[PDB]
């Protein structure tokens, strides 16, 4: 499941890295893979 | 239902016969297959729930 802390990290991570580096962002997060981050964003 | 499920899961295992260097995602698949091989009715309950309700 998704916790507000995490997706608030994801907003900032996407704001910084860009909308195509999902593996970087996925690395910012513990217990998330790049597929799930990309899914949650889209 | 359990015979059809055993056949499905054996077929899916047949990919990683080698038990190679695989990855995270195949690791996760093997996890799902094993826990459905152990507890075959939560599996089938999930399966029919999917077939009934999911369309995206």
């Amino acid at each position: 499941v998704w916790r507000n802390t995490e997706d608030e990290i994801l907003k900032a991570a996407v704001m910084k890295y860009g909308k195509n580096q999902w593996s970087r962002i996925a690395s910012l997060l513990h217990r998330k893979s790049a597929k799930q981050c990309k899914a949650r964003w889209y | 239902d359990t015979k059809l499920l055993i056949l499905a899961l054996e077929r899916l295992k047949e990919a990683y016969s080698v038990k190679s260097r695989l990855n995270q995602s195949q690791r996760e698949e093997l996890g799902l297959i094993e826990q459905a091989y152990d507890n075959p009715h939560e599996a089938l309950s999930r399966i029919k729930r999917h077939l009934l309700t999911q369309r995206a």
Partner: protein
């Protein structure tokens, strides 16, 4: 003759934060689908 700057989705050489909006910005359906689908229902 002013040239807008590029904000790419792949390169962030200096690691700069850009808001989602400015990061972001830089469908048809025929009418025969109706005739086909309704002919099928009939």
């Amino acid at each position: 003759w002013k040239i807008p700057p590029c904000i790419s989705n792949w390169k962030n050489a200096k690691g700069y934060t850009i808001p989602l909006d400015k990061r972001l910005a830089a469908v048809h359906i025929n009418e025969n689908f109706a005739k086909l689908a309704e002919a099928l229902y009939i």
